[PDB]
Amino acid sequence: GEYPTVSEIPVGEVRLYQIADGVWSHIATQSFDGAVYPSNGLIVRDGDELLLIDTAWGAKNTAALLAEIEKQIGLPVTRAVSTHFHDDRVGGVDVLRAAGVATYASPSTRRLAEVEGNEIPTHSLEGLSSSGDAVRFGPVELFYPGAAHSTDNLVVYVPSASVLYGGCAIYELSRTSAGNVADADLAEWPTSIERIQQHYPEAQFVIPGHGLPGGLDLLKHTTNVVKAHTNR
């Protein structure tokens, strides 16, 4: 097709995909419980610098990510935001820090990462602890929709491009059964998704944490999958 998939990406390689002017996704792959999964993050041009959303799921992949950014874009990554505390979002933070990137997460994410033993972004994102909270972070808005995939999950909106990055709280359309839900709040996840719809109804591109981008139709789709799992 056009968007990169697992079959195209050996573990250890990273692809970039331009979504809109000054907005890319990054796509990596990783082994998990006997299978290989793709995983997305985001890159947003921030003047003559770059803002990174999420690691590429591990130190080796994140080093490859920084090299691909330098090759293909050539602007410095100065800040990064991790959208929750799991390894596909913070695994590789130490590589970012060693490369001079100022790494950020909410206090909720930093607390959960510490308890779990995952890498801990250094700087705090305040103003996001209550469902419905939004704060500006340069060329993006950060939004805490409520507990969903995890209790700390954030979504990221790029207003200049109408790109909504949903992270692991939003599933791609071809996913028809739940992904990893060990730390999820199944009871609240649909309510949290509806908060995203109410806050970003103008979004034109919606990027899931794993798999193919689409539009806002990914939201009701995710709710339908989560409700089906709830009823297992």
Ligand SMILES: O=C(O)c1cccc2c1O[B-](O)(O)[C@@H](SCc1ccccc1)C2
């Ligand atoms: O997003 C998904 O659904 C997804 C699916 C497969 C692997 C992964 C996924 O994302 B994540 O952030 O949960 C992570 S596993 C997080 C975890 C691991 C072990 C014990 C508890 C929690 C990587």
Ligand SMILES: [Cl-]
């Ligand atoms: Cl700083």
Ligand SMILES: [Cl-]
């Ligand atoms: Cl559906």
Ligand SMILES: [Zn+2]
């Ligand atoms: Zn997760």
Ligand SMILES: [Zn+2]
């Ligand atoms: Zn700093």
Ligand SMILES: [Zn+2]
């Ligand atoms: Zn995930």
